[PDB]
Write a protein that binds this ligand. Structure first.
Ligand SMILES: [Zn+2]
Ligand SMILES: [Zn+2]
Length: 76
């Protein structure tokens, strides 16, 4: 005769109870800089609707602008 069994799980979550005040940050999407002073609402790339600074974007016509990755060359 013979037999054998096994099995186990590992749970790991944030830890802190359900209550995270200000659990959101605003950092560039190309340089991940501190966009604190800057405005993320307006600093949104119309291309990929992402968050970038006034340094990782390019000025375009029709008062539009896109991120280097967008306005710049193609990227896989
Ligand atoms: Zn973009
Ligand atoms: Zn940037």
């Amino acid at each position: 005769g013979s037999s054998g069994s096994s099995g186990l799980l590992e749970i790991k979550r944030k830890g802190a109870k359900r209550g995270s005040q200000h659990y959101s940050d605003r950092t560039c999407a190309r340089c991940q800089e501190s966009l604190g002073r800057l405005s993320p609402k307006t600093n949104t790339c119309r291309g990929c609707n992402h968050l970038v600074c006034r340094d990782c974007r390019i000025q375009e016509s029709n008062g539009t602008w896109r991120c280097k990755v967008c306005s710049g060359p193609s990227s896989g």
